[PDB]
Amino acid sequence: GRRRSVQWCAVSNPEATKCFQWQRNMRKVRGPPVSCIKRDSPIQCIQAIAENRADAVTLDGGFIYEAGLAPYKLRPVAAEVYGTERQPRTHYYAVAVVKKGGSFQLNELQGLKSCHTGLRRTAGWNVPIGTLRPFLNWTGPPEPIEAAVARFFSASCVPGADKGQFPNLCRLCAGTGENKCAFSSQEPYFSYSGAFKCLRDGAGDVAFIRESTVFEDLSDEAERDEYELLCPDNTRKPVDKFKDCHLARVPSHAVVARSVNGKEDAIWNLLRQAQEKFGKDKSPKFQLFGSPSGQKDLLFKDSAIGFSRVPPRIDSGLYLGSGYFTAIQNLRKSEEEVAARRARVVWCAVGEQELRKCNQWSGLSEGSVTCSSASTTEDCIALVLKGEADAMSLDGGYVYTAGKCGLVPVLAENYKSQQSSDPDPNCVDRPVEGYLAVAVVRRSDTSLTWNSVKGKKSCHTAVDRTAGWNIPMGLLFNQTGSCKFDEYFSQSCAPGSDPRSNLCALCIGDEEGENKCVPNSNERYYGYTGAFRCLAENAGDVAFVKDVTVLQNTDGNNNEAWAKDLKLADFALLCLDGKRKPVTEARSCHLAMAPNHAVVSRMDKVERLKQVLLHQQAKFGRNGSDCPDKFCLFQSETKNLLFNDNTECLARLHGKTTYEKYLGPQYVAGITNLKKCSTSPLLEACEFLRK
Ligand SMILES: *[C@@H]1O[C@H](CO[C@H]2O[C@@H](C)[C@@H](O)[C@@H](O)[C@@H]2O)[C@@H](O)[C@H](O[C@@H]2O[C@H](CO)[C@@H](O)[C@H](O)[C@H]2NC(C)=O)[C@H]1NC(C)=O
Ligand SMILES: *[C@@H]1O[C@H](CO[C@H]2O[C@@H](C)[C@@H](O)[C@@H](O)[C@@H]2O)[C@@H](O)[C@H](O)[C@H]1NC(C)=O
Ligand SMILES: [Cu+2]
Ligand SMILES: [Cu+2]
């Protein structure tokens, strides 16, 4: 396993030949070993990698999609970089290239002849087709969209299209015989290069390529002046005006490997080196990013400048981006099924118990709300990226991270006013006031104070929640200035921590002693109530929760047996000034103000999410038209499932529609600062995917 020699998969004769020369300058620099396997096509390459007969292959976005699917489940490990040394970029522009003289806009291509890089390819098929869907009058399954494309343009070249079913798609392929319109070099008109040629040769009226092809293939620059682009706003502009004129901005090709025992480091090292020795202009012996006058893009893209390593949290789905990923699956959808999905809100539920309540809510939503699930919040943030889930209510800590992931706050949870209104009929426009983070202890614990909580046992909501962690740990951090957060207290129950750390030391898992230290309600000590249960059961010595938590859980405010007999007066708060106060004085005895939990989504889901959540609260809200004979959206009672049980309503954001503006300057400064002690894999994945 983990390495030795990495078997690359060639898809061509001249790829094997380059793969073989590579094999050789490598051990001849006494570098890491690359051995080569052969096949006729990208999927044979995908099958091989999956049946362990090869380890890697650089695929186009289109095949990364394909490759991620079962029973493959292959992962991008390295992305190619484009542009130049410092203007390096892991993405390109799908453009629509035409010759000057004609005037016909991208809305005027019906009956035109077209040249495609190849079926299933990003700029060549996926985008241009996904872009003109409107005009195609397509019926939807089971009629392949190919049939609709074949009926749109007069004749086309699309390497890989079915000759037989789809005659016209191959029509202008220039290959000879069984080679006519094939997904290989045997076809003069394949890939970015063949497709531009098709255009050049008069064969096609439009070429659906990458933005660099005309610069890579037309030397004299007055030669280049014979083309222009078709902009999406039904315009025409210079081939160099591509940042202002492109169909899409897609992810660069990536090297994919198995995601089980994939030899990811074996692969990274070999790439890391080769790129050193033989990368852009260095060591003539060989050239990793160049192709013998005959061929083009052998094994990798002509003129790539290196590789960029794909952080492990990333999969096909996250690799592709929701926009794109979703776009490939919509090509196998009716414009009905596609509009159904759009109007529908997919909720992400953390753990089983929230799913139950989700199902339940779903059942009563008149199909507006459907449910999704994951075991952690982070996993739930990822399905929203994948466009596979659409929203969840989150604690401010996570709003930061989703935020970095590009999601935006949509509505915030509203709680019992500064004692402003009554069952405030105006709780949709009442600006939020955030909640109070506080440290609680047993009254009994006289001697315990702010100043001497350190090195004792702590109870936390979970790692990365405002009250529960950011605040307590950020304040202490600001003193000692240490990153060894597992040395602040002797033992804790901080769910979502290393089950092996001291920080999980006091977690109890589920009713069966399993699920211990998990960051969901199946851990008995998880969340607000859990953190408090931790204290009241003398597991921990302080509990980091909010004030309302003690109220809500004592004096038959909570009927769980754990909580029954607990009386408010038995607990106290710890002030930053070394004093101690009673739970009623939290307004003057709290660590800080936490921002209200907020519901986050993709920008594309916003207005509709708003509409649905608003409609739906009207019916199962606090004083809810169906609440509570039918369903109380805001109750799980003592569990804060999907929403905090104390939500008066979901209110409007008063213009703070950025994680930054919502969370505020100081708050974000602070998380960042804590984030450097260490970043989550998700934050790592989102940085990578952000540049
Ligand atoms: C796409 O549809 C438009 C209009 O949509 C409908 O056209 C109706 C007339 C019915 O047949 C519907 O069932 C149909 O889908 C079509 O206009 C368009 O192709 C037509 O363009 C043709 C070329 O000029 C022309 O022969 C027709 O006059 C024209 N529509 C009009 C005004 O009827 C379809 N484009 C396709 C299928 O690619
Ligand atoms: C947060 O840090 C601020 C900087 O002063 C602290 O810096 C340490 C290095 C140490 O010498 C301490 O004297 C200071 O507390 C500080 O002025 C703020 O009071 C700090 N506390 C909070 C939680 O705000
Ligand atoms: Cu490509
Ligand atoms: Cu919170």
Q: How many A from CA of 546 to the centre of ligand 2?
A: 24
Amino acid identity of residue 594, one-letter, is A
The closest-lying atom of ligand 1 relative to the alpha carbon of residue 110 is 38
Q: Is 259 a catalytic residue?
A: yes
In terms of Cα–Cα distance, which of 285, 284, 279, 281 is closest to 25?
A: 285
Taking the C-alpha atoms of residue 569 and residue 557, their distance in angstroms, rounded to an integer, is 14
Q: Identical fold at 1-91+251-339 and 435-594?
A: yes
Taking the C-alpha atoms of residue 640 and residue 77, their distance in angstroms, rounded to an integer, is 39
Q: How many A from CA of 483 to the centre of ligand 2?
A: 16
CB of 29 closer than 6 A to ligand 2?
no
Q: Which residues contact 679 (CB under 8 A, 6 or more apart)?
A: none
DSSP-assigned letters across all residues of 447-487 = T--GGG-TTSEEEES-TT-IIIIIHHHHHHHHHH--S-GGG
Q: How many A from CA of 82 to the centre of ligand 3?
A: 12
Could you tell me the fold of the domain covering 435-594? D-Maltodextrin-Binding Protein; domain 2 (3.40.190)
- The pick from 114, 137, 149 for probing ligand 1's pocket by mutation, whose C-beta has the most ligand atoms within 8 angstroms, reads 137
Radius of gyration of the chain (CA): 29
Residue nearest atom 23 in ligand 2 by C-alpha distance: 475
Ligand closest to Cα of 545 equals: 4
Amino acid identity of residue 88, one-letter, is P
Could you tell me if 106 and 231 are in contact, meaning their C-beta atoms sit under 8 angstroms apart? yes
Q: How many A from CA of 89 to the centre of ligand 2?
A: 41
Amino acid identity of residue 79, one-letter, is A
CB of 478 closer than 6 A to ligand 2?
yes
Taking the C-alpha atoms of residue 184 and residue 253, their distance in angstroms, rounded to an integer, is 17
CB of 476 closer than 6 A to ligand 2?
no
Residue nearest atom 24 in ligand 2 by C-alpha distance: 475
Q: What angle do the packed helices 13-27 and 264-278 form, to 10 degrees?
A: 80
Pick out the residues of the known binding site. 60, 92, 117, 121, 123-124, 192, 253, 395, 435, 461, 465, 467-468, 528, 597
In terms of Cα–Cα distance, which of 559, 545, 528 is closest to 645?
A: 528
Q: How many A from CA of 527 to the centre of ligand 4?
A: 8
Residue nearest atom 16 in ligand 1 by C-alpha distance: 137
Could you tell me if 389 and 347 are in contact, meaning their C-beta atoms sit under 8 angstroms apart? yes
**Cα angle at 289 between 288 and 290, to 5 degrees?**
100
Ligand closest to Cα of 118 equals: 3
CB of 176 closer than 6 A to ligand 2?
no
Q: How many A from CA of 317 to the centre of ligand 4?
A: 30
Ligand closest to Cα of 415 equals: 4
- The pick from 454, 479, 574, 575 for probing ligand 2's pocket by mutation, whose C-beta has the most ligand atoms within 8 angstroms, reads 479
Asked how this structure was determined, the answer is X-ray
Q: Give residue limits of the domains in the chain.
A: 1-91+251-339, 92-250, 340-434+595-691, 435-594
CATH of 340-434+595-691, one of 3.40.50.300, 1.10.760.10, 3.40.190.10, 1.10.3720.10: 3.40.190.10
Pick out the residues of the known binding site for hydrogencarbonate. 117, 121, 123-124, 461, 465, 467-468
Taking the C-alpha atoms of residue 540 and residue 438, their distance in angstroms, rounded to an integer, is 15
Query: Residue 512: exposed, middle, or buried by beta-carbon count in 10 A (0-12, 13-18, 19+)?
Result: exposed
Taking the C-alpha atoms of residue 371 and residue 359, their distance in angstroms, rounded to an integer, is 6
Could you tell me if 267 and 56 are in contact, meaning their C-beta atoms sit under 8 angstroms apart? yes
Residue nearest atom 1 in ligand 1 by C-alpha distance: 137
Could you tell me if 412 and 431 are in contact, meaning their C-beta atoms sit under 8 angstroms apart? no
CATH of 92-250, one of 2.40.50.140, 3.40.190.10, 3.20.20.80, 3.40.50.620: 3.40.190.10
Ligand closest to Cα of 477 equals: 2
Q: Which two tokens stand for residue 173?
A: 């392929």
In terms of Cα–Cα distance, which of 242, 239, 236 is closest to 101?
A: 236
Amino acid identity of residue 310, one-letter, is V
Q: What angle do the packed helices 42-50 and 61-68 form, to 10 degrees?
A: 40
In terms of Cα–Cα distance, which of 276, 283, 253 is closest to 78?
A: 253
Q: How many A from CA of 487 to the centre of ligand 2?
A: 19
The closest-lying atom of ligand 2 relative to the alpha carbon of residue 576 is 23
Q: Which residues contact 191 (CB under 8 A, 6 or more apart)?
A: 117, 118, 159, 296, 297
The closest-lying atom of ligand 2 relative to the alpha carbon of residue 479 is 8
The sign of the torsion formed by the CA atoms of 611, 668, 531, 351 equals positive
Whether omega before 628 lies within 30 degrees of 0, making that bond cis, reads yes
- DSSP lists the bridge partners of residue 574 as 580
457-460 vs 491-493, strand pairing mode: parallel
Q: From the candidates 5, 41, 154, 259, which is the catalytic residue?
A: 259
Could you tell me if 254 and 78 are in contact, meaning their C-beta atoms sit under 8 angstroms apart? yes
**In Å, what is the CA distance from 47 to each residue of 38, 66, 121, 374?**
12, 11, 18, 29
156-157 vs 114-116, strand pairing mode: parallel
Residue nearest atom 14 in ligand 2 by C-alpha distance: 479
Task: Give CATH superfamily name and number for 1-91+251-339.
Answer: Periplasmic binding protein-like II (3.40.190.10)
571-574 vs 580-581, strand pairing mode: antiparallel
228-240 in b/e form (b: 16+ CB < 10 A) is bbbbeeeebeebe
Pick out the residues of the known binding site for Fe(3+). 60, 92, 192, 253, 395, 435, 528, 597
* Residues in the ligand 1 pocket, defined by CB under 6 Å: 110, 135-137, 152
